[PDB]
Amino acid sequence: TCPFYKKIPGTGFTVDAFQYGVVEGCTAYFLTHFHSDHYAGLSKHFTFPVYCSEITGNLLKNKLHVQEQYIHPLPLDTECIVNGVKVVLLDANHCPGAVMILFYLPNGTVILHTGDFRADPSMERSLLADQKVHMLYLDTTYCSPEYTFPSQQEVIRFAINTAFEAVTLNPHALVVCGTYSIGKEKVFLAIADVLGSKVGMSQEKYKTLQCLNIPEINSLITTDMCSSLVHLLPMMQINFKGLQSHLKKCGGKYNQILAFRPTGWTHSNKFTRIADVIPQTKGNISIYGIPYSEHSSYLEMKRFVQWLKPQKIIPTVNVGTWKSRSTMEKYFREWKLEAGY
Ligand code: NI
Structure with a gap:
């Protein structure tokens, strides 16, 4: 069964959630990038709409043989409407084809899902500059200062x-x-x-x-x-x-x-x-x-988050142990107290 940090509340959407069978209430499955831990479960037998970048869609069709009719590529940096919800795909500075996804919820809430990413100051001048983000679903792979x-x-x-x-x-x-x-x-x-x-x-x-x-x-x-x-x-x-x-x-x-x-x-x-x-x-x-x-290194991650000033953070990596979750939560509060949001 699909974990909560792969669901987008207030939508029919899931992110990187192909290994759980048919997810109850999912009308569109997003795929951030073509890495096996994230695509796990896709094949030529998949019959729901998959939303992704052009490059990810080339890999789905040629490498996993997903049929063309179910692949929905979106251009980057472009406001798109999916099942009645505005979305944007942004370059994640990860592997080729990798995206972050901005969702503009019908109730006014704005959510950023980073996928896997390497934070960079160039991201401070994307379409993220123009509005507030309520919730950040964050790639916390290296969330400790030793990294x-x-x-x-x-x-x-x-x-x-x-x-x-x-x-x-x-x-x-x-x-x-x-x-x-x-x-x-x-x-x-x-x-x-x-x-x-x-x-x-x-x-x-x-x-x-x-x-x-x-x-x-x-x-x-x-x-x-x-x-x-x-x-x-x-x-x-x-x-x-x-x-x-x-x-x-x-x-x-x-x-x-x-x-x-x-x-x-x-x-x-x-x-x-x-x-x-x-x-x-x-x-x-x-x-x-x-x-x-x-x-992201620890420092690159910290800079991005202190710039973005999200109201809530949901880690997507290192979520399986209490010690990991407590360490991450401590750094998030440090960052917020230091920057003043
Ligand atoms: Ni990856």
Whole structure:
């Protein structure tokens, strides 16, 4: 049965609620983004209206085979009426296609559902600037001050400089990047661009990338692994055994692997600057963990919320333990007392 923090009161609507069967009274199911914990339950047999971005709708049709008649894509930054209620989709600065949803309830209440997001000051000049929000359903993934990490731009500067140095010292090195979902495409696209290579990958992952409206993509990716010196592999294979095995398959073209694992936060963020990051090495194989996040840091989250000044906050992440819920509630009250709302 569908939990309360996935229901929008005063509407027939649910958010990211596909794993509960037919939800009683739901007339439209919104999907914020194409990540498995959020789409869990959708397939070609789904027969209710799904509201989402254009990119999410390309993935629903091609990857999960949802029939076209039930997919309702909306443009961003545009007031739309759905089943008699005004809504707006806003860019979430998460993975490709990911949105926040503003609902303008018939009674005058305004609700923002962030989905998954990485808060940014640019959001302070979207259509959020123009009116008050009563309720915030918030992505609280990293809602604790110990969660620090660098900007995406610093992380990509590190990756590009590292890969270019390596391959210029040894033209026979291969670069490998891990993946398990959409998101974090800048990692492998930026490295391939500095090296003058396309990115090589499986047919399944090429298919997923072709749904994402990325400009000039045919110029950047390929299924011909032999023509490429940046390969994508599943995240589970990014270890010394899996990489050894891959190097065997390359027919003696290469004699060294430099590999990247984009993670979210890890506790090595509590000690080490991005500049100081070092790999794990065994023989001719080196693996770097790089903290490329598509969720808000604590500080980014706090800034957004203190700007928005919501009357009530409903967390959507870390909701399963009393200790988590109490920690989050304490920071929300600190933020409100400090800012004065
Ligand atoms: Ni996500």
